[PDB]
Design a protein around this ligand. Structure first.
Ligand SMILES: OC[C@@H]1[C@@H](O)[C@H](O)[C@@H](O)c2nc(CNc3ccccc3)cn21
Length: 437
């Protein structure tokens, strides 16, 4: 058997815009994902978050699912524009009430809330003022965070400032594939820098307001392997994985190969902000899904190489040893005091069988493999305190819309019916037993 430490936090994870629907209910402001997805051509099939999983109405049912599965922690995010419709200034009590009910319910049922302050749904009103490109977002984000800490910090004790700031900056502002949909490398690296300053201001305010909580930050990571016998792999790790942010946080500067590629794109006096950026954090969250074969390519000087490996419906190569590697590597490089896997999961082409069940053996296999490797990392000293499946529910998968299903619970969008998939029942057994067998 592979049993985990006493008190290990088994969780499931979601995000506000992906599950809630009702983006403009109860005085909420528009977010950039509202305006981006209502822009023709941005999202597959013209899909939007208007209805999504209707979690905005079905939240109690969904939490009852969490309880019934015996899952111990729920990672969810707060929609900034529900709380502050213009991004700063006015506070919307109805937005606060929505998350208060979720929080109180989880607590009553013995489930631990992990709150992501920002999972990509910036208020539109702030995007009009430049969003992440504007240095003033360090102030806006701090004010927003302060509101959350004051309203919920009595009950919520585990906080995440940002989900995947690399995606926010580069996919949102260089690739143009995510909101706000821009393609400017100088904007993208100012967003990188402002994301750090906003993260650090929010941590600073947390210490002033929530004397008992813990706060961290979440990064996306790939497992990069070199196509032959390498510096391309070094670059991809430092740019795409946690070092882009952790080197500022822990060491007070950007990683070396990031500066080689990107110094001209960062503000001229960016080092002036570094001492503030070093604000102490309590934990690192690592999201992990996939591995990549990578080669130097003269025509950022890196390309991916396709491998005959099992892939998910995203076309993402299934490489379980990556989650062990990234956990080892984070301890080796920065030694944070606590680590969580804040997302791990897979998209498969799920179908409800004639028996009324979703036989997602492919997802069970994927989860089991990765859980096994995280177990390994714990045996060799990585302080992993928890593991979160992405996702509780099939949901709006950003620019893929509803076409990608990541849930351990199937959602029939025509009726909003939830069907627990075999993987969800499987996971529940894992949580009950506190590990694999
Ligand atoms: O793609 C699945 C999930 C997504 O629904 C979450 O909102 C997000 O936190 C998330 N991040 C990754 C891994 N990195 C990534 C790759 C391509 C596009 C965006 C993020 C996967 N996921």
């Amino acid at each position: 058997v592979k049993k985990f430490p006493e008190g290990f936090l088994w969780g499931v994870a979601t995000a506000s815009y992906q599950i809630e629907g009702s983006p403009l209910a109860d005085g909420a402001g528009m977010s950039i994902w509202h305006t981006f997805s209502h822009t023709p051509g941005n999202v597959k099939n013209g899909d939007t978050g208007d209805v999504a999983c209707d979690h905005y109405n079905r939240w109690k049912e969904d939490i009852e699912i969490i309880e019934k599965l015996g899952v111990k922690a729920y990672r969810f995010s707060i929609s900034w524009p529900r709380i502050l419709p213009e991004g700063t200034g006015r506070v919307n009590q109805k937005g606060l009430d929505f998350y208060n009910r979720i929080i109180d319910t989880l607590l009553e049922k013995g489930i631990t809330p992990f709150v992501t302050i920002y999972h990509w749904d910036l208020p539109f009103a702030l995007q009009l003022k430049g969003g992440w490109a504007n240095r003033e977002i360090a102030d806006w984000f701090a004010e927003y965070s302060r509101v959350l800490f004051e309203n919920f910090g009595d009950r919520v004790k585990n906080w995440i400032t940002l989900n995947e700031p690399w995606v926010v900056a580069i996919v949102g502002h260089l690739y143009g594939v995510h909101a706000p949909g821009m393609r400017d490398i100088y904007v993208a690296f100012r967003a990188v820098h402002n994301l750090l300053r906003a993260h650090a201001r929010a941590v600073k305010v947390f210490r002033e307001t929530v004397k008992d909580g813990k706060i961290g930050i979440v990064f996306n990571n790939g497992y990069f392997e070199p196509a032959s016998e390498i510096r391309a792999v070094r670059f991809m790790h430092q740019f795409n994985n946690y070092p882009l942010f952790l080197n500022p946080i822990y060491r007070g500067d950007y990683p070396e190969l990031v500066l080689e590629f990107a110094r001209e794109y960062l503000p001229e006096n960016y080092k002036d902000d570094m001492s503030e950026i070093q604000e102490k954090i309590d934990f690192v969250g690592l999201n992990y899904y996939s591995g990549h074969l990578v080669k130097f390519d003269p025509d950022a000087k890196v390309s991916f190489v396709e491998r005959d490996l099992p892939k998910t419906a995203m076309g993402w190569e299934i490489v379980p040893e990556g989650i062990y590697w990234i956990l080892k590597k984070v301890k080796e490089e920065y030694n944070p005091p606590e680590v969580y896997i804040t997302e791990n999961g897979a998209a498969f082409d799920d179908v409800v069988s004639e028996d009324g069940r979703v036989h997602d053996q492919n997802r069970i296999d994927y989860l089991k493999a990765h859980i096994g490797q995280a177990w390994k990392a714990i045996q060799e000293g990585v302080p992993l305190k928890g593991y979160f499946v992405w996702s509780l529910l099939d949901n709006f998968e950003w620019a893929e819309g509803y076409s990608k299903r990541f849930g351990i619970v199937y959602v029939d969008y025509s009726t909003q019916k939830r069907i627990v998939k075999d993987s969800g029942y499987w996971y529940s057994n894992v949580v009950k037993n506190n590990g694999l067998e």
